[PDB]
Amino acid sequence: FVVKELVFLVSYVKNNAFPQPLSSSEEKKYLELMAKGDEHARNMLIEHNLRLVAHIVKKFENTGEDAEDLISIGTIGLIKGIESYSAGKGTKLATYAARCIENEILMHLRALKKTK
Amino acid sequence: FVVKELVFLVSYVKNNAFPQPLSSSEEKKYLELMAKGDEHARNMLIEHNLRLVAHIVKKFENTGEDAEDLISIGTIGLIKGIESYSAGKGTKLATYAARCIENEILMHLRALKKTK
Amino acid sequence: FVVKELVFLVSYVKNNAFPQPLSSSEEKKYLELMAKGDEHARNMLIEHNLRLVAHIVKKFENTGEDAEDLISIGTIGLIKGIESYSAGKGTKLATYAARCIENEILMHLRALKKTK
Amino acid sequence: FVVKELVFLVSYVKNNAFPQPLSSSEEKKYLELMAKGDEHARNMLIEHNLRLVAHIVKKFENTGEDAEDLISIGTIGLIKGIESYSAGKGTKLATYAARCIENEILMHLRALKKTK
Amino acid sequence: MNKWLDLILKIHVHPFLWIIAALGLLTGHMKALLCLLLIVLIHELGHAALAVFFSWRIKRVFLLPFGGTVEVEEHGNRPLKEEFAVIIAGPLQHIWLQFAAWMLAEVSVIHQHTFELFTFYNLSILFVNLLPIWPLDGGKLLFLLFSKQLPFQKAHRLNLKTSLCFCLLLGCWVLFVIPLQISAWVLFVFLAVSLFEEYRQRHYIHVRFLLERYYGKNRELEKLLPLTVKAEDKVYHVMAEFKRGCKHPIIIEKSGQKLSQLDENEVLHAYFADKRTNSSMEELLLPY
Amino acid sequence: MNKWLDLILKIHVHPFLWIIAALGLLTGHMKALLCLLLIVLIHELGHAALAVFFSWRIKRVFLLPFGGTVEVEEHGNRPLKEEFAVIIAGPLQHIWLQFAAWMLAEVSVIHQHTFELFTFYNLSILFVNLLPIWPLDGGKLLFLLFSKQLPFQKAHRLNLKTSLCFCLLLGCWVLFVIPLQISAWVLFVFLAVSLFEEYRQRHYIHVRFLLERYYGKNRELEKLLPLTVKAEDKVYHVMAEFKRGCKHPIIIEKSGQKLSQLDENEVLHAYFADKRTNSSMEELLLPY
Amino acid sequence: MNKWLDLILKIHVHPFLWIIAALGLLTGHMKALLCLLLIVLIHELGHAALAVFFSWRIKRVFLLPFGGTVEVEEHGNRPLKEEFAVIIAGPLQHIWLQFAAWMLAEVSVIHQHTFELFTFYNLSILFVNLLPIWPLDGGKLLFLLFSKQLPFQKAHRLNLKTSLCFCLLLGCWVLFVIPLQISAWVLFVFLAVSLFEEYRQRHYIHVRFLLERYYGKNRELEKLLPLTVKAEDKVYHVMAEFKRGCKHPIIIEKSGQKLSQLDENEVLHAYFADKRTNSSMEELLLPY
Amino acid sequence: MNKWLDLILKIHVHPFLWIIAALGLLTGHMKALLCLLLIVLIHELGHAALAVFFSWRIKRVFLLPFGGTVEVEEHGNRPLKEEFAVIIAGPLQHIWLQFAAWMLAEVSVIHQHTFELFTFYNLSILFVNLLPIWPLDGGKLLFLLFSKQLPFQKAHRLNLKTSLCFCLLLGCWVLFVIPLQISAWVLFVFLAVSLFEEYRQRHYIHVRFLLERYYGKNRELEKLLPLTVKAEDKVYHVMAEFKRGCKHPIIIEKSGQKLSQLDENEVLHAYFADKRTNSSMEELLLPY
Ligand SMILES: CCCCCCCCCCC(CCCCCCCCCC)(CO[C@H]1O[C@@H](CO)[C@H](O[C@@H]2O[C@@H](CO)[C@H](O)[C@@H](O)[C@@H]2O)[C@@H](O)[C@@H]1O)CO[C@H]1O[C@@H](CO)[C@H](O[C@@H]2O[C@@H](CO)[C@H](O)[C@@H](O)[C@@H]2O)[C@@H](O)[C@H]1O
Ligand SMILES: CCCCCCCCCCC(CCCCCCCCCC)(CO[C@H]1O[C@@H](CO)[C@H](O[C@@H]2O[C@@H](CO)[C@H](O)[C@@H](O)[C@@H]2O)[C@@H](O)[C@@H]1O)CO[C@H]1O[C@@H](CO)[C@H](O[C@@H]2O[C@@H](CO)[C@H](O)[C@@H](O)[C@@H]2O)[C@@H](O)[C@H]1O
Ligand SMILES: CCCCCCCCCCC(CCCCCCCCCC)(CO[C@H]1O[C@@H](CO)[C@H](O[C@@H]2O[C@@H](CO)[C@H](O)[C@@H](O)[C@@H]2O)[C@@H](O)[C@@H]1O)CO[C@H]1O[C@@H](CO)[C@H](O[C@@H]2O[C@@H](CO)[C@H](O)[C@@H](O)[C@@H]2O)[C@@H](O)[C@H]1O
Ligand SMILES: CCCCCCCCCCC(CCCCCCCCCC)(CO[C@H]1O[C@@H](CO)[C@H](O[C@@H]2O[C@@H](CO)[C@H](O)[C@@H](O)[C@@H]2O)[C@@H](O)[C@@H]1O)CO[C@H]1O[C@@H](CO)[C@H](O[C@@H]2O[C@@H](CO)[C@H](O)[C@@H](O)[C@@H]2O)[C@@H](O)[C@H]1O
Ligand SMILES: CCCCCCCCCCCCCCCC(=O)OC[C@H](COP(=O)(O)OCCN)OC(=O)CCCCCCCCCCCCCCC
Ligand SMILES: CCCCCCCCCCCCCCCC(=O)OC[C@H](COP(=O)(O)OCCN)OC(=O)CCCCCCCCCCCCCCC
């Protein structure tokens, strides 16, 4: 009776999951604060880099593993990489973290294969 | 009365805040004059590169500090880079000025962190 | 009757005359297969470069000669360039093909001028 | 009486004066027919290159000379360049013709200065 | 078919279609817009699926402001059966649309006055697209018959002539009956432009056909039909007497009495290997 | 001072909305466009203001063709009160909007007919944006209600089930009962797409929640609730039974006998820093 | 054959004409837009056809917001008959246009009111395009008439003076008598700009004419008219007194006495090839 | 002035102005369009000429769909007299336009009903552009008086506050009196946007002013006014007490009794040479 003249529309808040990558200025400041002591800088550094493990886990798909173990091991590898960064070697943090996470997942896979 | 038809048109003069970047021939002439020694050419060279100060200041946000001191320090860095510029290396002036501004801002930030 | 409203819409399949230019990785694969020996790969490589022949023929206008023999000679030049192509020099295939087209057309034009 | 509803419009033929520059294919053909013998090729070559003298003469302006002699001797220099072209040296016809015409006008200026 | 899903995922849309949709949204003609979009989309998806099945080279599925197209990249280089089956997959598919519409109307999911509009639009689009004008779908069905009855070049030219005559007849009919109805004028202009663009590349089409015939992969080998040709014509003038989907052994005639029998292989090798384009055929018996 | 101006420098407009407005201006739909735009803009500015006040990381205030959206980057991170305050700010501005409209109409600035349309749209949007379907605003309130009674993983699974059931019922209704209503098909499709995308990312939310929990430095410690575990399940099953904003001492059960309490911080330390995962609490009870 | 299609691939449209047509379609000005476009297009296609037939170097068929233009690259090059035939082709198509319109209106395809507007526009454009102002069409006919009687330089100066006087009179009338008439200010400004641009380039035309004359190889030799010169003026003054399409033997006057005739080819050869300029005919009478 | 001709030769035009002109051409409002274009063009040319005379840095003369602008590149770095003379050159120029219009009407070149429209539009544009709101032309005339009476920063802030108050008053007046007349709303939103954009760069404006004051070329050296400041405030806070077009010797006060007298030269050299930004001034008497 009142329908056909409603116009529904919508308004929401859309909580994102992966923060946008940091620019070329905040990473150095956060690293310096971490060097002088700041755990919040470490939290932001490990939170602003979830896209890497997001594509890495899907790249290791169609092999017969549940997603929880893969994502957990990827986050552990990301912590490994971010904790022991040596930026003076002349490289980007992204490739170092990707190498660390893929190597750690390879270690997990080798351990699983040896156990099986 | 006759208010129904007025056609509110505008006519004014627009004052730009940051002058648009300058070309190469007369900027080389400006550096030659500065080497010879002239304050006006130095003033034009300084004021034509405030756009860089604007960008590097705005991208250093997300820190909580006010913009007045950051703007002043950026201007000091730009003037220091202009005065101490060396053309023998073989690089563009803008990159050297931006790097000098970045170094000055990082140095002042480290000093502020130490004195906090 | 009901001719007043028909809405003449169209639905068909469009046959391109010249296929759009091909990428680099699978073209290198095509050359490797041709070196191994395959007629189909040669056919694809030849028919993906008819656009160059079209341009060379159209810019060789303003002469009075018909287009049939020019098109045939351009195709012969293209097949000669593709068959005799050498990758050791270190240049793009398209430039070599176009140069072969130009050389073949000039060679035939000299004989045509000598005959008439 | 009939006016205010006219709509004038226009249709003409607009005879150009300077032909558009030749592309990268007709010049070699015209040179070849000139080598084997064709005065029409020479006419086309000296007609399609009349754009250069237009700016050459204006670049020798504000010196106190009537444009008639300047343009006549510029065409004379263009004939100089076209007749004595040696394209095997690895250069463009345009710069050779420009050098020849400017040298010819400089010779005229020197002769006039010596006579005066 | 995964490639079918990839094709569906990347359908392009012309910018003017968005403006047409926005205009129809603010006025109240959305039902007809959805009906037409659904009909055209399914009609094109049928073509796309039957093209993917035979492993052709599809580039992009497009939605013009006046219909939709599939931009395949094969012209005059495929066997007749494939080029018939791909074409016939469109009109042979409105049947299941009609049946589904009838069933849904009978179940009373949709009202009565909606079921009539869909049937009218469906039948009208089928009948319009069944017209015998290139490219549409009747012209590409008549061209196959012509090529089966005549050589390639003659069939191509006859198709062009008949299509042009029918296009002028349709234009005159539109002018005398209904000068209005913009859609008719748009269709007429599109037909004329497409006919001109296709006529501009006959030589390149023939060249593609000949090069395809050279590297023949022996696709379901066919019969052999001999040709009675004298040894006084040009080789390019006898190459234009090849029938699609067949083999043409050559019989060489010299002054009334034939000399010998020639095959397509050696003459094709001479034309595309010896750089002998348009010299002669009297010495093809003993080339060198 | 300056944060609000920074917020003002974040608004973006979708390209299709420009065309929608441009076509609406010409056709004559102007008394409704302003009302809809103003209502949506205020309803979103409320969220933006109470998100900026609590120091959240805004990204855009994007305005869509079928509504508006604000984008933050805080999923399962901030405490309950912050999220409740941010969410409730939406369905509150309508009260003062209606009050201001009534005041403006009492002194006769807007005609009586205009007042009816504005209040109609206001109430309609307010009641539509309260449905218990994710994300909207009803679904988020229901999720907040669930998170205060149940563990986090169960509260994220049951919400996804309930929203799916409600969306399926709504879709069935809107397709098979109501005639057309183009403005509701968009809502249904958007709800389905958002629900599917949310379902596809159920593990990253959990890992982010765990990381946030581990990195709390005396972040206003609160209600203490000890928990008990058995020797069968690993540490992962223990971690799944956590509640938002609560510290849970763990009782180690050695097959009937209880040794002592287990701190949460040491469990997280062994899971993340000590790298001592893939083991049961029996190994945890006897570490290095 | 193919030349006409090549011509068809040369038409260009100014960007402002697209906006003009788009706005005219919506406002309701459609019965006049087609008439104007068709008349202009045919009036220019006549020029294009009889320019292509005589093997001229067309560049575009550009269509302007206030009319149309075709661009060639032959200034003072081709003989008189070619230019006369090309020019006269314009104000001739209107006859068959009017005949066809009358025939189409007699069988009642177009209403009587439409017929009046078309013939009004046809006659108006035909009579406007015959004014004796450069370039138009009357000015070029007057230039041909002057050239067939007078030396080339005088025929190029007197025409430029007369066209300037006529344009000044027209400008005075249109500015100080008729009220506004925006469609005439454009015509006046365009005429003034074209006249100034043509006046600024009065020497390149002469040098092109001389170059064309020198490079004629028995190009249909015609009427012979000997000329006489004196010892005072140089060779430049002798060259200025040349007529189009005529060979002029020159009598050398040695202060009252006449030596013999002087060939034109040898004079041109000494001027261009022998490099022997900047001298009087006395030096020419005693060459190397 | 050759630079004036160069400026006139390269006037830019916004694309929407062409569409407005095309719409006016097909409806019949061309006389008013020409009147407004002429008035705005001359009003802007006056500013351009008086800016070129003083050798400023002009960039481009622009024609927006609602007026015209001159984009100079000088802000807060010029003597007061120049920035007054350049501003006053606009309104002081409608007088000769009015006189010429009156004379032309009296000679009977133009009718009576055209002379009234021009006068109405001219006076209306002058009165509208004389309003005291930044940027317009009344705001830039009040700001000069404020800067002559107050220091630079305080004058800037007071100007911003008064301009904002007047903008809100004008908006309320427009809303209550005439909701229609799109031009008023366009002017209002333009004023608001310009005010916001100008307020966003106060610090950069002040920095430019200080840098210009550093390399002072002694432009008509003026009086000296001492400042009573104590040696306990920041140097940046006392730098904000400089008056435009004046010299400010510094008097340093230390515990009631002044210490010595300081000039701008040494303090400015310390600020821009010694890297001492915001430390203190108690040691400026004996820096190092
Ligand atoms: C971020 C903000 C975004 C805002 C967007 C622009 C907002 C523009 C609103 C446009 C819109 C809804 C469009 C919704 C689409 C949004 C979904 C987005 C999807 C994106 C892909 C609202 O239109 C309303 O506007 C009101 C103001 O004018 C009017 O109602 C007021 O009520 C009085 C009471 O007091 C007031 O007194 C009085 O003043 C008004 O009468 C009406 O115009 C109408 O109610 C158009 O409504 C449409 O409804 C359909 C019938 O279903 C109509 O269909 C046709 O109607 C017949 C007439 O032809 C035809 O014969 C028939 O064949 C066909 O059925 C359309 O005609 C059209 O009317
Ligand atoms: C990739 C997809 C592409 C889709 C394109 C758009 C498809 C949308 C179709 C739109 C469209 C066809 C026109 C197509 C022209 C565009 C051609 C496109 C070429 C692009 C370059 C709808 O046509 C159908 O729409 C149906 C909607 O319900 C209605 O059918 C009904 O449904 C059931 C109810 O009971 C029944 O069962 C059924 O019996 C009914 O008949 C009817 O409106 C009609 O049948 C527009 O309608 C057209 O007809 C009339 C008004 O009707 C208008 O005449 C105007 O009248 C004056 C009074 O204003 C105007 O002053 C004047 O201006 C003009 O004279 C037209 O101007 C136009 O408006
Ligand atoms: C490459 C081809 C380019 C073609 C361009 C598009 C062609 C579109 C033509 C548009 C155009 C001329 C525009 C010329 C500009 C070109 C110059 C270019 C310069 C570029 C920078 C022709 O318009 C004609 O079109 C005819 C067809 O409709 C109509 O006349 C037919 O006659 C009957 C007899 O039989 C027929 O029976 C019947 O059918 C028609 O009545 C009329 O519309 C008119 O005569 C518009 O005319 C304009 O005239 C002015 C009065 O000076 C009018 O001003 C206003 O009039 C009042 C009404 O508001 C206002 O109250 C008043 O305030 C104001 O005075 C305008 O209104 C407008 O009318
Ligand atoms: C860089 C240069 C920028 C120049 C911009 C354009 C300047 C062109 C001015 C155009 C314009 C002002 C409107 C401006 C709005 C645009 C604001 C621009 C903002 C850009 C974002 C002309 O306004 C003047 O034009 C004069 C032309 O002669 C006439 O004056 C006369 O001249 C002498 C004769 O005797 C006398 O002496 C003198 O006494 C006369 O008065 C009058 O028309 C008027 O004075 C448009 O006129 C407007 O008024 C009326 C119709 O009149 C229209 O109302 C419509 O009526 C309904 C019936 O259709 C419509 O249904 C409805 O829709 C609408 O209600 C308006 O809609 C609009 O048409
Ligand atoms: C695979 C793609 C599907 C192809 C066939 C589906 C469409 C057939 C034609 C129906 C009309 C065209 C709809 C355009 C919009 C319109 O016109 O109206 C839209 C009508 C409005 O109904 P109403 O307002 O008239 O009455 C309203 C009285 N309650 O709601 C619809 O129909 C929605 C579409 C049906 C919903 C199911 C979706 C498809 C399911 C599978 C279909 C069956 C498959 C085969 C089963 C064996
Ligand atoms: C330097 C730039 C010039 C500035 C001043 C010129 C304009 C003053 C205002 C006149 C009305 C504005 C015209 C807009 C179009 C319009 O409105 O109509 C346009 C009117 C139509 O006249 P009509 O249809 O009403 O009657 C028609 C009855 N016959 O023809 C004009 O006027 C054309 C403009 C005048 C022509 C001379 C050009 C300028 C010469 C120099 C001017 C004098 C200089 C100082 C002399 C001491």
Numbering used by the authors:
A (entry chain H), B (entry chain F), C (entry chain B), D (entry chain D): 11 to 126
E (entry chain A), F (entry chain G), G (entry chain C), H (entry chain E): 1 to 288
Question: What did the publication describing this PDB structure actually write?
Answer:
S2P intramembrane metalloproteases regulate diverse signaling pathways across all three domains of life. Here we determine the cryo-EM structure of the S2P family intramembrane metalloprotease SpoIVFB from Bacillus subtilis bound to its native substrate Pro-σK. The structure and accompanying biochemical data demonstrate that SpoIVFB positions Pro-σK at the enzyme active site through a β-sheet augmentation mechanism, and reveal key interactions between Pro-σK and the interdomain linker connecting SpoIVFB transmembrane and CBS domains. Finally, the zinc-metalloprotease activity of SpoIVFB results in cleavage of the N-terminal pro-sequence of Pro-σK within the interior of the lipid membrane, allowing the mature σK to diffuse from the outer forespore membrane into the mother cell cytoplasm, bind to RNA polymerase core subunits, and initiate transcription of genes involved in the final stages of B. subtilis spore maturation (step 3).
Thus, although WT SpoIVFB appears to display robust enzymatic activity in E. coli, this activity is lost after detergent solubilization and purification of WT SpoIVFB and Pro-σK. To further investigate the overall architecture of detergent-solubilized SpoIVFB and Pro-σK preparations, we pursued cryo-EM reconstructions of both WT and E44Q SpoIVFB co-purified with Pro-σK. In total, the physical interaction between monomers in the WT SpoIVFB:Pro-σK tetramer is quite limited (~488Å2 for interface 1, ~510Å2 for interface 2), which likely makes for fragile interactions between SpoIVFB:Pro-σK monomers that are largely mediated by lipid/detergent. As elaborated on below and in the discussion, we believe that the oligomeric arrangement of SpoIVFB:Pro-σK monomers in the tetramer is likely an artifact of detergent solubilization, rather than a representation of an oligomeric state that is sampled in vivo. Aside from the difference in oligomeric state, which we believe arises simply from variations between protein preparations and fragile monomer interfaces, the final structures of WT and E44Q SpoIVFB:Pro-σK monomers are virtually superimposable (RMSD ~ 0.5 Å). For this reason, we refer to WT SpoIVFB:Pro-σK in the following presentation of results due to the slightly higher overall resolution obtained for this complex. While the orientation of zinc-coordinating residues H43, H47, and D137 of SpoIVFB are conserved with those of mjS2P, the cryo-EM map of WT SpoIVFB:Pro-σK does not show any appreciable density for an ion being coordinated by these residues. This lack of density was consistent in the cryo-EM maps of both WT and E44Q SpoIVFB:Pro-σK, demonstrating that SpoIVFB:Pro-σK complexes fail to co-purify with the Zn2+ ion that is essential for supporting Pro-σK cleavage. Thus, the cryo-EM maps provide an explanation for why WT SpoIVFB consistently co-purifies with full-length unprocessed Pro-σK despite displaying robust proteolytic activity in E. coli.
